[PDB]
């Protein structure tokens, strides 16, 4: 609740761009972590 | 045997006009309050229902496909990832006693219960 | 001048800190929205009566405790970029994220058992 | 008179028993209709016409197919994003802005 | 995540 | 009192509530004894943890002389101040419920 | 529980369900203590 | 026993049947993403349709390629 409300409050359809950016970058972080680990 | 109580010793007695200004609620008001009570009653259920209906619609769409009938073959996406990724064995790690175990893996993948 | 140029792609003008003061004094600024990660930037929308009509200006605010009284004294309407409607959509999104995992696992199971038995390869 | 009275009772209770399951049989009949549409010869004719349409479209769209499959991300959007993102982080040095990239 | 970090750094109270 | 319908109810900015509360606080430099009465109902949420749609902070329902109602959303305790404090926060955007509670406490002196 | 599904919830639920229906498992305990 | 497996290559011991099965299941799971994405994001309002189409396509292909690289 607090995460999403904060990115809504601070910065039309701009809230949707910011929310999609947030979700996308989070999933990509987890995937990159897993792959880099399994590459040893 | 019972006792009796005067029915004027059991009821309150006051006429609304002896009240402060805005204490008496009109019908206009009192109806809006009932509307809010109902909406607050159904709010959370409604919202969870919508958020699950989204996923259910997606799952029904994925159900409608059912397979490949209607999809032609594609040459950028064969069905075996080794063709696409250019993977093949080398010179080491290849024992002559391996094919045996290979087979049983195969036998367990195709469902053959013999093993 | 305005008379010797082509109209091009409405954007935000820029006031420094001072014509903002004079403008909100003369009663011309009509609404103000605060923004900036440190809450020191203003987007001010003027009113028709001003010289130049309704425009959208940008101002940078360096701490001044007289600002709020000045604004609220001259009928200005402050604002926050959030309506219950928007918060209520954020709640919906959080709920979808809550549900996404069980639906994902039941879809995975269903497709495993579908591929495995009830629609295999033909031979 | 008596046996037809017992039959009238079983008929009324059959009315009730038929109506209590009416949503279930309604969904069942809708499913039967649904899966009945998709084994005709008409659906086969549709599938074959769609096959021809796909064949025609695939013979006219080879450049765009290669663009969207092999070129769009890997050689147009990924390097731009990578360079812009690297230069967003990475302080305003020279070893970091130009030489290490 | 470095674009949104000034935004998400209010949940901690800093700038 | 029953929770209103926050969707179909007009809103007010926190700075407007702050100024309107200063104008009714006889110990402030902005007093005026010609102010019309206000009825404030301060709501806190109870379905915060059990159910979607819960909100943080406080919500004020201001009813006025016209019989009409508006509401203010005081999430976000703005900047910590004591109750015996009379000074705005350098930015109309740092008004939370700490300043509002300061004004409510000082008005009843 | 439908509004916030959790794994702890389903564990507690199946435990309560065993309590109602199949805690007499500890009666099958005594019934299989017959041969022991 | 266990040593003939523990001492050999692993892509030659495992058949291709299982790779095809994994790929089929994955493909079937994630094939409804373009239509889902499109129908979600669509509620000078029509300058955004080509970009939503582009994003749907690129996103689907990225998921397939991440399976590939893993
Ligand atoms: C410069 C970018 C530095 C930004 C790093 C900021 C903090 C990283 C948090 C990562 C936590 C992941 C984790 O849970 O840590 C665990 C994880 C273990 O899997 O740690 C790892 O593996 C770390 C993976 C190695 C990271 C190095 C990649 C950065 C540079 C990318 C290649 C240079 C790109 C090409 C240059 C192009 C020039 C224009």
XYZ file of C-alpha atoms and ligand atoms in Angstrom:
648
model
C 0.000 0.000 0.000
C 2.658 2.518 0.999
C 4.962 1.821 -1.946
C 2.265 2.260 -4.556
C 0.621 5.223 -2.855
C 3.969 7.003 -2.666
C 4.770 6.641 -6.338
C 1.206 7.766 -7.060
C 1.406 10.819 -4.804
C 4.776 12.152 -5.848
C 4.918 12.095 -9.646
C -2.355 12.353 -18.234
C -1.575 8.649 -17.688
C 1.723 9.049 -15.869
C 0.839 6.971 -12.821
C 0.337 4.016 -15.148
C 3.733 4.491 -16.768
C 5.372 4.663 -13.352
C 3.548 1.583 -12.071
C 4.432 -0.483 -15.125
C 8.054 0.624 -14.818
C 8.066 -0.429 -11.166
C 6.642 -3.900 -11.762
C 8.826 -4.544 -14.802
C 12.073 -3.569 -13.097
C 11.263 -5.677 -10.034
C 10.612 -8.854 -12.020
C 13.736 -8.238 -14.064
C 15.819 -7.853 -10.915
C 14.717 -11.238 -9.618
C 15.324 -12.947 -12.960
C 18.778 -11.434 -13.409
C 19.736 -12.510 -9.894
C 18.700 -16.108 -10.526
C 20.455 -16.384 -13.884
C 23.691 -14.819 -12.679
C 23.728 -17.217 -9.739
C 23.162 -20.282 -11.886
C 25.974 -19.188 -14.202
C 28.725 -20.379 -11.816
C -50.712 -14.514 39.561
C -49.034 -11.473 38.004
C -48.516 -7.811 38.865
C -49.334 -4.881 36.603
C -47.270 -1.898 35.490
C -48.845 1.307 34.119
C -48.001 1.676 30.441
C -47.167 5.329 31.055
C -44.352 4.235 33.375
C -42.734 2.388 30.443
C -42.656 4.893 27.560
C -40.712 8.112 27.095
C -42.555 11.370 26.458
C -40.992 14.176 24.443
C -41.959 16.021 21.275
C -39.143 16.422 18.718
C -39.596 20.206 18.641
C -37.916 20.484 22.069
C -34.588 19.392 20.525
C -31.636 21.399 19.172
C -31.639 22.707 15.629
C -30.238 20.034 13.348
C -30.839 16.967 15.495
C -33.950 15.944 13.576
C -32.980 14.043 10.427
C -35.111 14.512 7.271
C -35.957 11.688 4.869
C -33.536 13.066 2.230
C -30.706 12.694 4.777
C -31.769 9.402 6.456
C -31.972 7.702 3.003
C -28.430 8.685 1.993
C -27.202 7.212 5.270
C -28.851 3.902 4.421
C -27.242 4.065 0.980
C -23.795 4.505 2.515
C -24.464 1.683 4.987
C -25.250 -0.695 2.125
C -22.277 0.362 0.025
C -19.933 -0.037 2.980
C -21.474 -3.461 3.443
C -20.568 -4.661 -0.045
C -17.362 -2.694 -0.772
C -14.618 -5.208 -0.014
C -16.431 -8.175 -1.528
C -17.046 -6.220 -4.731
C -13.412 -5.210 -5.072
C -12.027 -8.698 -4.494
C -14.592 -10.000 -6.985
C -13.339 -7.661 -9.701
C -9.697 -8.470 -9.008
C -10.406 -12.187 -9.346
C -12.644 -11.807 -12.385
C -9.706 -10.334 -14.262
C -7.640 -13.493 -13.752
C -10.617 -15.714 -14.537
C -11.152 -13.947 -17.854
C -7.499 -14.469 -18.724
C -7.758 -18.168 -17.859
C -10.906 -18.633 -19.938
C -9.189 -17.008 -22.899
C -6.222 -19.349 -22.517
C -8.715 -22.212 -22.368
C -10.350 -21.242 -25.657
C -7.094 -21.931 -27.507
C -6.857 -25.608 -26.458
C -3.852 -26.480 -28.602
C -2.250 -25.895 -31.983
C -5.051 -26.481 -34.436
C -5.090 -23.187 -36.198
C -1.437 -22.443 -35.653
C 0.822 -23.102 -38.632
C 4.437 -24.201 -38.248
C 6.949 -21.457 -37.584
C 10.602 -21.515 -38.531
C 11.897 -19.032 -35.982
C 10.433 -21.173 -33.180
C 10.811 -24.911 -33.695
C 9.441 -27.214 -31.039
C 12.771 -28.553 -29.765
C 15.005 -26.010 -27.999
C 18.201 -27.830 -28.938
C 17.711 -27.133 -32.650
C 17.148 -23.472 -31.827
C 20.102 -23.248 -29.427
C 22.650 -25.371 -31.365
C 23.482 -27.841 -28.588
C 25.282 -31.139 -29.170
C 27.713 -33.364 -27.240
C 31.493 -33.239 -27.373
C 34.264 -35.779 -26.802
C 34.379 -36.145 -23.010
C 31.650 -37.125 -20.595
C 30.453 -39.820 -23.015
C 30.590 -43.275 -21.442
C 29.560 -46.421 -23.285
C 27.518 -47.435 -20.249
C 25.360 -44.336 -20.421
C 22.917 -45.301 -23.159
C 21.420 -47.921 -20.799
C 20.320 -45.358 -18.233
C 19.310 -43.080 -21.102
C 16.720 -45.646 -22.136
C 15.058 -45.880 -18.747
C 14.775 -42.096 -18.570
C 13.032 -42.340 -21.930
C 10.899 -45.197 -20.641
C 9.807 -43.072 -17.671
C 9.041 -39.966 -19.802
C 6.841 -41.725 -22.402
C 4.901 -43.308 -19.506
C 6.124 -46.888 -20.187
C 5.557 -48.463 -16.727
C 7.870 -51.443 -17.285
C 11.161 -49.712 -16.343
C 6.113 39.385 -29.139
C 3.237 36.954 -29.625
C 2.348 38.532 -32.986
C 5.571 37.532 -34.767
C 5.867 33.796 -34.164
C 4.183 30.497 -34.988
C 2.042 28.783 -32.382
C 3.972 25.716 -31.231
C 3.169 22.874 -28.877
C 1.725 24.205 -25.610
C 4.241 23.825 -22.766
C 4.891 25.197 -19.274
C 6.143 28.758 -18.941
C 8.661 29.664 -16.246
C 8.402 32.350 -13.573
C 11.406 33.001 -11.400
C 10.110 33.531 -7.884
C 8.970 37.122 -8.090
C 6.439 37.683 -10.854
C 4.745 34.745 -9.168
C 4.541 36.905 -6.051
C 3.193 39.923 -7.928
C 0.767 37.760 -9.898
C -0.675 35.983 -6.877
C -0.873 39.394 -5.233
C -2.849 40.977 -8.058
C -5.336 38.114 -7.724
C -4.440 36.457 -11.016
C -3.119 33.019 -10.054
C -6.088 30.669 -9.828
C -4.765 27.301 -8.690
C -1.471 25.868 -7.480
C -0.144 22.312 -7.372
C 2.992 21.371 -5.472
C 5.412 18.777 -6.784
C 9.063 17.831 -6.667
C 10.695 15.002 -4.730
C 11.473 17.558 -2.012
C 8.192 19.474 -2.494
C 9.697 22.769 -3.641
C 8.344 23.140 -7.190
C 5.025 24.732 -8.118
C 2.822 24.383 -11.180
C 0.516 27.389 -11.198
C -2.507 27.810 -13.452
C -3.648 31.398 -13.952
C -7.149 32.707 -14.660
C -8.603 34.216 -17.816
C -8.514 37.785 -16.492
C -4.714 37.788 -16.426
C -2.632 39.395 -19.192
C -2.111 36.407 -21.481
C -5.059 34.205 -20.537
C -4.950 30.868 -18.778
C -1.430 29.471 -18.929
C 0.508 26.842 -16.989
C 3.635 28.212 -15.335
C 6.448 26.616 -13.358
C 8.131 28.131 -10.303
C 10.965 26.933 -8.063
C 10.282 27.530 -4.343
C 13.140 28.357 -1.944
C 11.829 28.057 1.683
C 9.581 31.050 2.613
C 7.117 30.756 5.559
C 5.029 33.683 4.288
C 3.914 31.763 1.199
C 0.915 29.911 2.616
C -0.769 32.952 4.146
C -0.180 34.952 0.963
C -1.772 32.238 -1.171
C -4.764 31.442 1.025
C -5.423 35.152 1.591
C -5.996 35.876 -2.113
C -8.480 33.068 -2.825
C -5.929 30.713 -4.418
C -6.885 27.023 -4.376
C -4.037 24.642 -3.465
C -4.272 21.024 -4.716
C -2.823 17.497 -4.378
C -2.511 15.136 -7.343
C -4.701 12.369 -5.857
C -8.458 11.695 -5.936
C -10.184 8.880 -4.049
C -10.772 7.431 -7.571
C -7.000 7.110 -8.173
C -6.256 5.545 -4.752
C -9.122 3.115 -5.364
C -7.425 1.953 -8.612
C -4.116 1.462 -6.764
C -5.985 -0.746 -4.303
C -7.325 -2.800 -7.205
C -3.814 -3.264 -8.556
C -2.490 -4.385 -5.177
C -5.267 -6.967 -4.995
C -4.434 -8.332 -8.448
C -0.814 -8.683 -7.377
C -2.048 -10.501 -4.294
C -3.977 -13.037 -6.354
C -1.455 -13.571 -9.145
C 0.412 -16.476 -7.519
C -2.321 -19.074 -6.795
C -3.867 -18.511 -10.209
C -0.420 -18.997 -11.710
C 0.086 -22.333 -9.976
C -3.337 -23.691 -10.883
C -2.782 -22.676 -14.495
C 0.581 -24.432 -14.439
C -0.928 -27.608 -13.014
C -3.808 -27.608 -15.471
C -1.503 -27.225 -18.447
C 0.833 -29.931 -17.184
C -1.973 -32.466 -16.926
C -3.468 -31.291 -20.216
C -0.250 -31.731 -22.171
C 0.513 -34.997 -20.410
C -2.637 -37.083 -20.951
C -5.705 -35.375 -22.317
C -4.078 -33.978 -25.476
C -0.769 -35.726 -26.256
C 1.182 -36.277 -29.464
C -0.664 -38.516 -31.911
C 1.266 -41.798 -31.886
C -58.589 -42.522 -9.080
C -56.025 -43.358 -6.403
C -53.148 -44.443 -8.665
C -53.502 -41.335 -10.816
C -53.493 -39.314 -7.583
C -50.131 -40.866 -6.692
C -49.023 -40.066 -10.247
C -50.163 -36.455 -9.807
C -48.072 -36.245 -6.630
C -45.026 -37.667 -8.418
C -45.680 -35.213 -11.271
C -45.755 -32.158 -8.991
C -42.638 -33.302 -7.153
C -41.086 -33.880 -10.579
C -41.857 -30.250 -11.422
C -40.002 -29.205 -8.265
C -37.113 -31.627 -8.873
C -36.750 -30.391 -12.449
C -36.711 -26.744 -11.414
C -34.249 -27.105 -8.523
C -31.541 -28.320 -10.942
C -32.374 -25.816 -13.677
C -29.176 -23.685 -13.413
C -27.017 -26.819 -13.584
C -28.812 -28.162 -16.663
C -28.785 -24.649 -18.135
C -24.993 -24.462 -17.981
C -24.896 -28.035 -19.278
C -27.019 -27.194 -22.305
C -24.971 -24.076 -22.992
C -21.812 -26.201 -22.932
C -23.440 -28.721 -25.267
C -24.331 -25.946 -27.702
C -20.800 -24.544 -27.454
C -19.053 -27.815 -28.222
C -21.603 -28.592 -30.928
C -20.520 -25.621 -33.036
C -16.966 -26.943 -33.291
C -17.286 -30.305 -34.986
C -19.311 -29.438 -38.093
C -18.087 -29.341 -41.653
C -18.728 -25.601 -41.507
C -16.013 -25.168 -38.914
C -13.663 -27.227 -41.076
C -14.350 -24.966 -44.047
C -13.564 -22.002 -41.823
C -10.298 -23.529 -40.657
C -9.191 -24.220 -44.222
C -10.056 -20.724 -45.430
C -8.049 -19.320 -42.528
C -5.164 -21.542 -43.558
C -5.187 -20.053 -47.040
C -5.357 -16.540 -45.619
C -2.357 -17.216 -43.390
C -0.385 -18.598 -46.332
C -1.104 -15.521 -48.426
C -0.173 -13.178 -45.572
C 3.060 -15.001 -44.833
C 4.249 -14.724 -48.401
C 3.826 -10.928 -48.355
C 5.405 -10.144 -44.987
C 8.932 -11.506 -44.894
C 10.816 -8.263 -44.266
C 8.564 -7.270 -41.392
C 8.729 -10.748 -39.915
C 12.510 -10.672 -39.840
C 12.473 -7.144 -38.448
C 10.193 -7.982 -35.556
C 11.888 -11.300 -34.828
C 15.617 -10.652 -35.179
C 16.237 -6.927 -35.375
C 13.822 -4.884 -33.271
C 15.090 -5.621 -29.773
C 18.530 -7.094 -30.267
C 19.972 -4.466 -32.607
C 17.790 -1.373 -32.196
C 16.305 -0.969 -28.704
C 18.664 -2.914 -26.480
C 21.887 -1.027 -27.342
C 20.185 2.351 -27.058
C 18.690 1.477 -23.684
C 21.997 0.026 -22.496
C 24.064 3.073 -23.376
C 21.550 5.572 -22.014
C 21.196 3.588 -18.782
C 24.947 3.270 -18.301
C 25.391 6.999 -18.764
C 22.567 7.751 -16.327
C 24.465 6.073 -13.469
C 28.260 6.219 -13.497
C 29.578 9.618 -12.280
C 30.786 12.439 -14.547
C 34.344 11.197 -14.767
C 36.228 10.387 -17.954
C 37.394 6.865 -17.150
C 33.732 6.102 -16.512
C 31.941 8.188 -19.128
C 34.023 7.323 -22.198
C 36.993 5.043 -21.611
C 35.472 2.084 -19.768
C 32.386 1.846 -21.996
C 15.002 1.557 -9.940
C 17.263 4.597 -9.775
C 14.590 6.685 -11.472
C 12.011 5.937 -8.776
C 14.426 6.080 -5.843
C 13.835 9.783 -5.046
C 10.135 8.947 -4.968
C 10.502 5.790 -2.866
C 12.857 7.496 -0.429
C 9.965 9.160 1.381
C 8.979 5.820 2.947
C 12.156 6.274 5.015
C 11.975 10.018 5.713
C 15.100 11.188 3.866
C 15.701 13.197 0.695
C -21.601 8.547 12.864
C -21.736 6.653 9.575
C -18.770 6.719 7.245
C -19.682 8.862 4.224
C -19.185 7.894 0.607
C -15.721 9.279 -0.012
C -16.153 8.987 -3.784
C -19.239 11.206 -4.061
C -18.197 13.936 -1.624
C -16.414 17.226 -2.330
C -12.841 17.560 -1.143
C -10.751 20.262 0.494
C -7.075 20.740 0.687
C -5.199 20.363 3.984
C -3.900 23.925 3.672
C -7.472 25.173 3.472
C -8.354 23.313 6.665
C -5.245 24.701 8.344
C -6.109 28.278 7.439
C -9.741 27.827 8.426
C -8.654 26.437 11.782
C -6.230 29.288 12.369
C -9.050 31.744 11.695
C -10.949 30.184 14.615
C -8.080 29.922 17.119
C -8.301 32.915 19.429
C -4.633 32.652 20.430
C -3.346 33.076 16.877
C -2.343 36.165 14.939
C -4.994 35.369 12.308
C -8.094 35.357 14.500
C -11.378 36.784 13.296
C -14.547 36.620 15.433
C -16.834 36.680 12.367
C -16.185 33.047 11.454
C -19.091 30.711 10.887
C -19.335 27.548 12.982
C -17.746 24.327 11.780
C -18.481 20.765 12.801
C -15.450 18.494 12.459
C -15.771 14.721 12.577
C -12.386 13.010 12.610
C -12.550 9.467 11.235
C -9.981 6.719 11.510
C -10.133 3.504 9.490
C -10.802 0.143 11.133
C -10.738 -2.251 8.169
C -7.122 -1.279 7.615
C -5.653 -4.758 8.046
C -8.661 -6.977 7.232
C -9.826 -6.028 3.765
C -8.630 -4.191 0.689
C -9.270 -0.416 0.372
C -8.109 0.549 3.879
C -6.414 3.922 4.192
C -3.796 5.395 6.542
C -3.956 8.476 8.701
C -7.081 10.501 9.427
C -9.991 11.876 7.447
C -11.884 14.986 8.493
C -15.507 15.683 7.591
C -16.208 19.412 7.799
C -19.837 20.485 7.860
C -20.613 24.175 7.614
C -23.416 26.713 8.001
C -25.017 25.761 4.699
C -25.582 22.248 6.015
C -23.207 21.019 3.299
C -20.211 18.773 3.886
C -16.657 18.488 2.582
C -13.793 16.206 3.489
C -10.040 16.441 3.983
C -7.534 13.600 3.711
C -4.887 13.886 6.419
C -2.625 10.999 5.691
C 1.034 11.775 5.947
C 1.825 13.351 9.314
C 3.548 16.312 7.790
C 6.293 17.508 10.087
C 6.518 16.803 13.781
C 5.643 19.819 15.928
C 4.590 20.203 19.522
C 1.078 21.223 20.468
C 2.096 24.715 21.605
C 3.367 25.734 18.181
C 2.311 28.596 15.891
C 4.376 28.678 12.718
C 3.597 27.344 9.234
C 5.979 24.729 7.778
C 7.923 26.609 5.026
C 5.874 24.776 2.358
C 2.074 24.458 2.157
C 2.749 20.762 1.363
C 4.103 19.855 4.843
C 0.701 20.223 6.580
C -0.200 16.862 8.115
C -2.271 15.967 11.123
C 0.344 17.180 13.586
C -0.289 20.818 12.670
C -4.039 20.236 12.585
C -3.956 18.687 16.043
C -1.842 21.591 17.281
C -4.500 24.022 16.089
C -7.324 21.973 17.583
C -5.501 21.850 20.914
C -4.796 25.571 21.005
C -8.298 26.626 19.985
C -9.797 25.391 23.267
C -7.657 27.506 25.568
C -9.469 -15.494 3.846
C -10.544 -15.164 0.220
C -9.631 -11.488 0.399
C -6.072 -12.290 1.565
C -5.084 -15.881 0.804
C -2.108 -17.149 2.776
C -0.418 -20.502 3.330
C -0.654 -20.291 7.120
C -4.399 -19.969 6.585
C -4.642 -23.180 4.572
C -2.518 -25.085 7.095
C -4.705 -23.951 9.984
C -7.771 -24.743 7.890
C -6.727 -28.306 7.095
C -5.804 -28.779 10.755
C -9.277 -27.678 11.859
C -10.770 -29.900 9.166
C -8.852 -32.849 10.550
C -10.173 -31.872 13.979
C -13.761 -32.012 12.748
C -13.663 -34.945 10.315
C -10.431 -36.899 10.692
C -8.995 -36.403 14.161
C -10.776 -39.719 14.881
C -7.523 -40.745 13.263
C -6.545 -40.993 16.930
C -9.454 -43.426 17.255
C -8.018 -45.439 14.378
C -4.967 -45.228 16.644
C -6.714 -47.281 19.325
C -8.386 -49.473 16.700
C -5.011 -50.411 15.163
C -3.568 -50.906 18.629
C -5.736 -54.071 18.448
C -2.916 -56.155 16.863
C -0.198 -53.718 17.973
C 24.646 -47.104 -10.255
C 24.918 -43.433 -9.330
C 28.483 -42.987 -10.582
C 27.818 -43.500 -14.291
C 25.464 -40.530 -14.036
C 27.613 -38.482 -11.661
C 30.621 -38.840 -13.991
C 29.124 -38.164 -17.432
C 27.677 -35.260 -19.365
C 24.084 -34.431 -18.551
C 22.580 -33.415 -21.897
C 23.495 -36.802 -23.375
C 21.919 -38.761 -20.510
C 18.647 -36.817 -20.618
C 16.399 -37.350 -23.663
C 14.972 -34.574 -25.801
C 11.446 -35.674 -24.920
C 11.574 -33.869 -21.593
C 12.871 -30.656 -23.151
C 10.010 -30.724 -25.630
C 7.541 -31.316 -22.803
C 8.868 -28.414 -20.723
C 8.829 -26.118 -23.733
C 5.269 -27.100 -24.639
C 3.966 -26.437 -21.146
C 5.749 -23.083 -20.921
C 4.550 -22.001 -24.364
C 0.956 -22.886 -23.507
C 1.126 -21.025 -20.212
C 2.419 -17.723 -21.541
C 0.675 -17.490 -24.910
C -2.224 -15.281 -23.814
C -0.013 -12.384 -22.687
C -0.399 -10.075 -25.727
C -4.199 -10.062 -25.671
C -4.300 -9.772 -21.878
C -1.833 -6.865 -21.857
C -3.650 -5.089 -24.698
C -7.077 -5.433 -23.112
C -5.754 -4.267 -19.753
C -3.962 -1.122 -20.865
C -6.816 0.029 -23.145
C -9.119 1.152 -20.349
C -5.601 12.074 -29.032
C -6.490 8.862 -27.229
C -5.628 6.847 -30.357
C -1.982 7.858 -30.814
C -1.185 5.149 -28.253
C -2.426 2.075 -30.124
C 0.738 1.357 -32.180
C 2.902 1.659 -29.080
C 0.722 -0.723 -27.095
C 0.913 -3.230 -29.939
C 4.700 -2.862 -30.007
C 4.978 -3.388 -26.264
C 2.777 -6.479 -26.330
C 4.883 -8.113 -29.025
C 8.221 -7.213 -27.469
C 7.137 -8.357 -24.009
C 5.919 -11.752 -25.195
C 9.107 -12.368 -27.140
C 11.229 -11.306 -24.172
C 9.567 -13.910 -21.969
C 10.232 -16.644 -24.519
C 13.848 -15.544 -24.837
C 14.339 -15.535 -21.070
C 13.244 -19.155 -20.998
C 15.791 -19.725 -23.764
C 18.696 -18.086 -21.951
C 17.951 -19.775 -18.644
C 27.407 0.081 -13.110
C 26.097 -0.532 -12.546
C 26.245 -0.751 -11.020
C 24.853 -0.803 -10.365
C 24.892 -1.719 -9.124
C 24.065 -1.074 -7.967
C 23.817 -2.105 -6.829
C 23.618 -3.508 -7.433
C 22.504 -4.253 -6.642
C 22.390 -5.699 -7.194
C 21.803 -6.639 -6.117
C 21.668 -8.038 -6.773
C 22.025 -9.147 -5.758
O 21.185 -9.599 -5.058
O 23.353 -9.632 -5.672
C 23.439 -11.028 -5.861
C 24.051 -11.266 -7.232
C 24.454 -12.721 -7.275
O 23.727 -13.372 -8.280
O 25.158 -10.405 -7.378
C 25.652 -10.248 -8.714
O 25.770 -11.182 -9.422
C 26.052 -8.882 -9.313
C 26.015 -9.104 -10.854
C 27.182 -8.374 -11.553
C 26.779 -6.910 -11.775
C 27.694 -6.308 -12.845
C 26.831 -5.816 -14.009
C 26.881 -4.286 -14.057
C 27.441 -3.840 -15.407
C 26.709 -4.574 -16.534
C 27.711 -4.926 -17.656
C 28.521 -3.674 -18.039
C 27.401 -3.609 -19.115
C 28.037 -3.272 -20.496
C 28.517 -1.802 -20.492
C 27.924 -1.078 -21.719
C 28.701 0.228 -21.922
C 27.810 1.253 -22.647
